[PDB]
Write a protein that binds this DNA or RNA. Structure first.
Ligand code: MG
Ligand code: MG
Ligand code: MG
Lengths: 170, 137, 178, 206, 244, 30
RNA sequence: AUACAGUGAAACUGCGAAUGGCUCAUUAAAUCAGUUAUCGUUUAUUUGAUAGUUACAUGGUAUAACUGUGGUAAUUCUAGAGCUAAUACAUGCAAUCUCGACCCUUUGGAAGAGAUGUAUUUAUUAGGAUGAUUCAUAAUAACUUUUCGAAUCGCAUGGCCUUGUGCUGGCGAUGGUUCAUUCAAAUUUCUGCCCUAUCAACUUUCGAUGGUAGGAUAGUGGCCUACCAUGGUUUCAACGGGUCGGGUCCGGAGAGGGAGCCUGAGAAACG
């Protein structure tokens, strides 16, 4: 039923074009994948060609990357906090790309103690806000993957002016 | 710059806060070719534009056209006017015709209603925008 | 034990402060079961992209345990290796212990320690009997095999060279971290 | 009602027509997969146990497992494609024409056509490991001698037929494996030599 | 059509095949292969309507299934295999070797060659790029992907491929004064020397070609195939030497 | 603004006209 | 032919059925004709390259055809029993290359030090080709309900000896990862002869024009959605009214009504 054909729209002049032809299979769309936090739950989608797309209907874990330190760890996703496109995705805790989520900081905390031996010092120094978040127990991260296409919720921890701007918006 | 709900950044360009080597935020740019000079204001500017041919994820290829600006009342897009003479054989006569072409204009350019612009074709930016301003004069 | 749900169980069941995490009272009884189970998974040969990931995941859950349990896991790895006779005597290797089988067990032990050093780094708990003594005994074994054995035992010599190369790598690391 | 009783150990099966409604009554209210005692059915079945497995109604429609009704319903049947077709319920009732039973256990007396008679398996094992399992052969034993052979006679002619062993280890298969391994080795070596020559060409050019 | 076509009407077949208009209602549709549909000669047409060695399609099928016909040193059994420009066709039983070259008229010519001249072919380097594991390779006009080329080789150069091993024996750079064959446009089949190569960025490059009679004509770069330096072509030419 | 239906439009809609009929009896209580 | 071996119905697997054929109701840049791009995409097959990272070969977690018992008024309607296989379905296994002391021998051996899949997702780093790239390619850390890396077949029985059917093997077939190529498909740039003002406003009245972000797409894209800007065409005629295309071929559709799905590389399928 969903279609991407541009024939139905009005012409640039504003004329109402007539229905040229029936809907074709090569111009289809599929229903959105409202990823919500919960037990992992994905089903494959057989797309054009032999390719396959994974639909992340539900997901609770993701690989998140600390870019400044250039490390990546698998962490649980606590909950959505702020989403730029629409707010009501925040209310229902829906996951999509560019959504800001709160992730458990425990693996990063353990790794940091392992690598730096601190709860040498100048390198260990990190932004004040990130240390405050570590104290809190949850880290603000931005999802970089597209859960409705690849079935993953990979992303990275907010840092610097990213963190400043999003904290202001919060 | 950051006048939107979502943050604006050049994708996959990373600025390492820990190293803090440079005061200036790292900026990525390319030269569009066809002898079209990339302006400096793009190089050391601070705007973010995904559809800028010099800083965005767009490539200029295909026909290159010229026209006169007729409207600039939009955010980062304009309407130019291309005139020509259409020949009717039956009345063996020319008639003045014009077509209005919408075009994306990068913020690295400053354009007024009336100046001449050379534009290059690009992948469909919007419903009607298929071109991108590449030289103002 | 199930392969498909192995990973997601780790991030839920064993994650520190996790909602499903084991209770402090139940740590004593349950944890011995957990260590044995992971030890079986850690011996999977890393022949593919997925198999490598599972091995890393098994080693990556260790920091979540408490330090006494980490030592317990290391002790299990060294239990098969017989090193008490070596240090008990004046640092003399037994020819009977010198076999291809014994080297294979040593290589399995050293590989676990090398991986565990990478994840824990400065926090790695080092103990004589648990780690350092078996680690030392392994490097001594590689030297003895390398010199004593003839060129005919090309495989055994090759394996001995690998153990020494890994053994010295391990010692260089443990000093650097702890 | 007619009862189609099957003894699976034999592979035998026979039909018994029923007239009195009282054994039919003890069969009433039961369900597919349940068990009934033959002694209630009749003295001939004394000591037996029947598991109900299927059957057909007076209109010929079959019963289906998993549905709890005493009547017919149009259910969406499958094996990809699915068809809405009528099926009887799984509850035994007076609407059933023929009821199929499997003898789980044998009673005191022996049924004439079921417990006394056998029907041999139509075909024997074909895969080698199946032959070994069927005859319990050791690994050292070679299955080739123990394969089942059936004699076929045409008039005065007579000759033996035996199946083709699959999954058998034969010199051809070892040769194929050896050839595959050698082929991989040769391709790798040729590619390394090509890379070396390319490096030499670059070295000469520089 | 709702998918790939499989039938080719006779009148819609390429003109240069010279198929009888009254024979039937369909023509051989060249199967997928090294050469384009419109720029190829399927083996059925070459064996039947050019050499006349077969009287009908069935006889061509028998000829091929005997494994007598080799296309570029490899046996082919598909009747509609798309043989093309600089293709070597060998018939061992008849002691015949052929190389497909456009005559001045612009149609494929039956050009008999010696075995030594059949041991190699020429390929225009259509593309040069690095493959997986950082191994450079060249794609020629006939679809061959040759790895570890000479670094000097660039696009529009022409390489000399030995068929037995499928390796580059030598190469010719694209430059002024080189001998060139016209493989498309109105001047197809003519031979000349490069004089000057006009360059238009973002558009089709044009080149000027002068023939031995000193007449000059311009052609797009895509339709030029370098065959050697002036007066010393690396292959045998058809009768007339592509003049007029 | 009115685009995408964000502004309420009260003009009659033929497809949903007379989609259902009222009950004349009214609510159970008087 | 003492496993089978010639031929071979049936059945399971594999491929194909989107080609071909037929009629013209529709629609006046909608298709279409010429022309251009894909640095914006998918592509069965063909052709050319390309994967050293219990095993003298695993299971039924398996059934058809087939044997046999029946129900029904009855069908390409049926259920109960009993077998048996794979290129079906599952599972699965003592090497090479660098720096090279000894400069021992001066090709050379060589102590020791090292290095060693692919596929998906994200983050980060370096970066031969084109005018131009965040391109090609390489590396690091992790991720996967995640792949793939011959448990396959025909013909023949050569070379070695350590006589064991010991070791080592010739030509083909069918598979399979990625890239290129071909067959295609999808969008897309510019231009393109009717009468009209007695058709002067139209679009924005469930997007109209544009930006940011997401969802979907094989992908670009108001294609759809959230927020925000107020716009776009037109007296050089927008909007509206009237009247199959190009040249037997090439295009364009459609085959109880309407809605919803399904496989496949390709269909909104004449299934
Ligand atoms: Mg009746
Ligand atoms: Mg098919
Ligand atoms: Mg977008």
């Amino acid at each position: 039923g969903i279609s991407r054909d541009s024939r139905h729209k009005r012409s640039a002049t504003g004329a109402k074009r007539a229905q040229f032809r029936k809907k074709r299979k090569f111009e289809l769309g599929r229903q959105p994948a409202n990823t919500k936090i919960g037990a992992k739950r994905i089903h494959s989608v057989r797309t054009r060609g032999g390719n396959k797309k994974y639909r992340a209907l539900r997901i609770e874990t993701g690989n998140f990357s600390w870019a400044s330190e250039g490390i990546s760890k698998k962490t649980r996703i606590a909950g959505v906090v702020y989403h730029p496109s629409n707010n009501e995705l925040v209310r229902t805790n829906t996951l999509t790309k560019a959504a800001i989520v709160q992730i458990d900081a425990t693996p990063f905390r353990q790794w940091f103690e392992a690598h730096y031996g601190q709860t040498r010092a100048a390198s260990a120094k990190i932004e004040s806000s990130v240390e405050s978040q570590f104290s809190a127990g949850r880290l603000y991260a931005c999802i970089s993957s597209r859960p409705g296409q690849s079935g993953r919720c990979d992303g990275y921890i907010l840092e610097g002016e990213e963190l400043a701007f999003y904290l202001r918006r919060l | 710059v950051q006048s939107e709900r979502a943050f604006q950044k050049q994708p996959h360009i990373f600025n390492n806060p820990k190293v803090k080597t440079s005061k200036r935020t790292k900026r990525w740019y390319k030269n569009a070719g066809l002898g079209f000079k990339t302006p400096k204001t793009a190089i050391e500017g601070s705007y973010i534009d995904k559809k800028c041919p010099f800083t965005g994820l767009v490539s200029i290829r295909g026909k290159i056209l010229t026209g006169t600006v007729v409207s600039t009342k939009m955010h980062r897009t304009i309407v130019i006017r291309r005139a020509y003479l259409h020949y009717i054989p039956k009345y063996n006569r020319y008639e003045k015709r014009h077509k209005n072409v919408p075009v994306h204009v990068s913020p690295a350019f400053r354009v007024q209603v009336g100046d001449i612009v050379t534009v290059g074709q690009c992948r469909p930016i919007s419903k009607t925008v298929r071109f991108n301003v590449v030289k103002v004069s | 034990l199930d392969d498909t749900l192995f990973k997601d169980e780790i991030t839920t069941f064993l994650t520190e402060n996790g909602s499903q995490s084991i209770k402090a009272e139940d740590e004593k009884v349950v944890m011995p079961y957990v260590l044995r189970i992971f030890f079986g998974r850690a011996q999977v040969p890393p022949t593919s992209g997925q198999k490598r990931s599972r091995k890393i995941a098994v080693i990556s859950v260790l920091p979540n345990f408490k330090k006494p349990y980490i030592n317990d896991f290391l002790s299990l790895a060294s239990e098969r290796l017989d090193y008490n006779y070596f240090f008990g005597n004046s640092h003399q290797i037994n020819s009977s212990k010198a076999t291809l089988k014994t080297i294979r067990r040593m290589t399995g032990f050293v590989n676990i320690v090398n991986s565990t050093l990478s994840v824990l780094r400065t926090n790695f708990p080092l103990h004589t009997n648990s780690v350092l003594q078996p680690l030392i005994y392994s490097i001594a074994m590689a030297y003895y095999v390398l010199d004593t054995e003839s060129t005919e035992e090309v495989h055994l010599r090759k394996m001995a060279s690998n153990l020494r190369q890994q053994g010295l790598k391990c010692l260089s690391s443990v000093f650097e971290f702890v | 009602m007619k009862l189609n009783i099957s003894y699976p150990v034999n592979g035998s099966q026979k039909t018994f027509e029923i007239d009195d409604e009282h054994r039919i009554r003890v069969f009433f209210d039961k369900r597919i997969g349940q068990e009934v005692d033959g002694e209630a059915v009749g003295d001939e079945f004394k000591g037996y146990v029947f598991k109900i497995s299927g059957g057909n109604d007076k209109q010929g429609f079959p019963m289906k497992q998993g549905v709890l009704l005493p009547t017919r319903i149009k259910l969406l049947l499958t094996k990809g494609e699915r068809k809405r077709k009528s099926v009887r319920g799984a509850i035994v009732g007076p609407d059933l024409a023929v009821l199929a039973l499997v003898i789980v256990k044998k009673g005191e007396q022996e049924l004439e056509g079921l417990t006394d008679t056998t029907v041999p398996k139509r075909l024997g094992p074909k895969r080698a490991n199946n032959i070994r399992k069927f005859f319990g052969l050791s690994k050292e034993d070679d299955v080739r001698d123990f394969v089942i052979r059936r004699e076929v006679t045409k008039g005065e002619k007579t000759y033996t037929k035996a199946p083709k062993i699959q999954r058998l280890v034969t010199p051809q298969r070892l040769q194929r494996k050896r050839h595959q391994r050698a082929l991989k080795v040769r391709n790798a070596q040729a590619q390394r030599e090509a890379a070396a020559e390319y490096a030499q060409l670059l070295a000469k050019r520089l | 059509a709702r998918g790939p076509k499989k039938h080719l009407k006779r009148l819609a077949a390429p003109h240069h095949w010279l198929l009888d208009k009254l024979s039937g209602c369909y023509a051989p549709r060249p199967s997928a292969g090294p050469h384009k549909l419109r720029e190829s000669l399927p083996l059925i047409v070459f064996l039947r309507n050019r050499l006349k060695y077969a009287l009908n399609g069935r006889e061509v099928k028998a000829i091929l299934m005997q494994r007598h016909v080799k296309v570029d040193g490899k046996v082919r059994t598909d009747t509609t295999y798309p043989a093309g420009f600089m293709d070597v066709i060998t018939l061992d039983a008849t002691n015949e070797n052929f190389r497909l070259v456009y005559d001045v008229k612009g149609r494929f010519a039956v050009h008999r060659i010696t075995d030594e001249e059949a041991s190699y072919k020429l390929g225009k380097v259509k593309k040069v790029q690095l493959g997986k594991k950082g191994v450079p390779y060249v794609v020629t006009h006939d679809g061959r992907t040759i790895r570890y080329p000479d670094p000097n080789i660039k696009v529009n150069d022409t390489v000399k491929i030995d068929l037995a091993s499928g390796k580059i024996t030598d190469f010719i750079k694209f430059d002024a004064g080189k001998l060139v064959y016209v493989t498309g446009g109105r001047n197809l089949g003519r031979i000349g020397t490069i004089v000057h190569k006009e360059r238009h960025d973002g558009g089709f490059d044009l080149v000027h070609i002068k023939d031995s009679l000193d007449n000059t004509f311009v052609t797009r770069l895509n339709n030029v195939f370098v065959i050697g330096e002036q007066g010393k072509p690396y292959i045998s030419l058809p009768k007339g030497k592509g003049i007029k | 603004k009115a685009s995408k239906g964000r502004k309420l439009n009260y003009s009659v809609q033929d497809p949903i006209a007379n989609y259902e009929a009222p009950i004349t009896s009214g609510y159970k209580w008087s």
